[PDB]
Structure formats: C-alpha cells, structure tokens
Amino acid sequence: ATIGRISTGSKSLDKLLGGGIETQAITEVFGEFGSGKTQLAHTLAVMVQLPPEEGGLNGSVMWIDTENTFRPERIREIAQNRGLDPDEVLKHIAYARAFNSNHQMLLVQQAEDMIKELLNTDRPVKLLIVDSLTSHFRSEYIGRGALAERQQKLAKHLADLHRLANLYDIAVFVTNQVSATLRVYLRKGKGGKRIARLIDAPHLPEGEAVFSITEKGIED
C-alpha cells in the first residue's frame, strides 16, 4: 500500500516531516519534561480519525501507556476544539497500560489481534502509540551488567513494532528521552513555543519547525 501520512496539526511540523508522520514507519520523538511529545501524541490520536482531506486516515488508534500520561480529558478537548465528537473520538482509542517492560512487549505482540480484527473495516488501526518506549527498560535494567539484555529486548520490541507498521500499514509513534526510526527532538523555544528538529533522516533534510500547544493540541 502507498505510504499514508497523518497531520501533526502543525503545518510547520508537517512540512519538516514531508507531510506528516508516515504509515509503515516508526516515528520516535525525544524530549524532556514539558517538551510537547505527549501533547503531540494526543493530537495525532485525534487527527488520524479525520478523513485524508482533513489530515487523517479515517483510522482507529491503539495506545500503550507506560507511565500514566494518557489524558482522556485532553483527547476530548482536542476533539471538540477541532469540531469532532469527543465521545466518538475516545471510543476509537484502544487504551492499554503497560506495567513493566515484559508486559509492554507482550502488549505489542498481542495488539496484532485487534489490528487483524479491524483491518478490513471502516476504521482500521492506523496509529499505534507507545508512550514511552523506554521508561520501563531504563527502570528495570540498571548498570552495565544489564545493558546487553536491555538492548536486545528493546531491539526485539522495535522489530515487532516495525513488523506491525509494515504489514498492516500503520503509523507507529513512540516517545523517548535522550533507521530503525525517524528521530525528532523537541525542545523549548521562545515565549512558550516548542521547536522540533529532525535528525539523521535518510531521505528528508534535517531542519527545524516551530510550533505551539493550544486547546487544539499541536498547531503552528
């Protein structure tokens, strides 16, 4: 299938990304606390439900939350401020809490079932979020005796995510803190604006996009 793109809500950021985040890809967004990465996640979970003409893929969402950062009320706000029905938008985000790194890996594996179920329906899964990719791995695998296993488990986890993205035409979006992924680094700009910098993309120029966080989520 042709690569689809989901608008981030920001024209500036979309331009930097070549149109939006891609299906058949893992977009990995880095940032310190308050960077906007989770706000971007919340915005994408609404945007993807729109028709292509409005920046979406008429899709549903699966959301794996490792540190209790998903806010249903924020989804409702973004949905309503963008003219959608907040209750409908929430119903199409399948939520899972991951309690530890093993569980997180299992949740990605088990996600394939729902993906298959929805595949040839009116609302196929088009966005799979892991927020965040590494919090559990960082907590559980301490020091150098644990590095080898941490990297191997993380590598397998990313491989599983890649397979789902490619096989089922899904945009995978993961957050992190400092191929195989498209890496975007968020930082604070001036006057409460945020800045995204794209780094090491094989076929997109490096660059920056300035964006705002509003009642609509992310926008210029």
Ligand X SMILES: COC(=O)c1cccc2[nH]ccc12
- Between 107 and 195, name the residue whose CB sits nearer to ligand X: 107
The region of 21-29, 88-96, 140-148, 189-197 touching ligand X under the rule CB under 6 A is 88-96
**Minimum distance from residue 185 beta carbon to ligand X (Å):** 26
In DSSP terms, 26 is beta-bridged to 172
Q: Which of residues 95-134 bind ligand X (CB under 6 A)?
A: 95-96, 107, 110-111, 114
Q: Which of residues 179-198 bind ligand X (CB under 6 A)?
A: none
- Between 125 and 198, name the residue whose CB sits nearer to ligand X: 125
Q: Return d(Cα 205, Cα 91) in angstroms, integer.
A: 37
Question: Strand, coil or helix: what is 186?
Answer: strand
**Minimum distance from residue 18 beta carbon to ligand X (Å):** 27
Q: Which of residues 44-83 bind ligand X (CB under 6 A)?
A: 62, 64
Return binding residues for ATP: 31-38
Q: Which residue has tokens 């003219």? A: 83
Q: Residue 184: how many CB atoms within 10 A of its CB?
A: 25
Instruction: Kindly state the number of chain residues that form the binding site for ligand X, as judged by CB under 6 A.
Output: 9
> Which residues have CB under 8 Å from 21's CB, separation 6+?
5, 6, 8, 27, 44, 171, 173, 182
- Between 131 and 219, name the residue whose CB sits nearer to ligand X: 131
Q: Is 213 one of the binding residues for ligand X (CB under 6 A)?
A: no
**Minimum distance from residue 117 beta carbon to ligand X (Å):** 11
- Between 47 and 111, name the residue whose CB sits nearer to ligand X: 111
> Which residues have CB under 8 Å from 157's CB, separation 6+?
104, 105, 108, 133
Q: Return d(Cα 204, Cα 14) in angstroms, integer.
A: 12
Tokens representing residue 128 in the block: 């799979």
Please give the residue ranges that form the binding site for ligand X (CB under 6 A). 62, 64, 94-96, 107, 110-111, 114
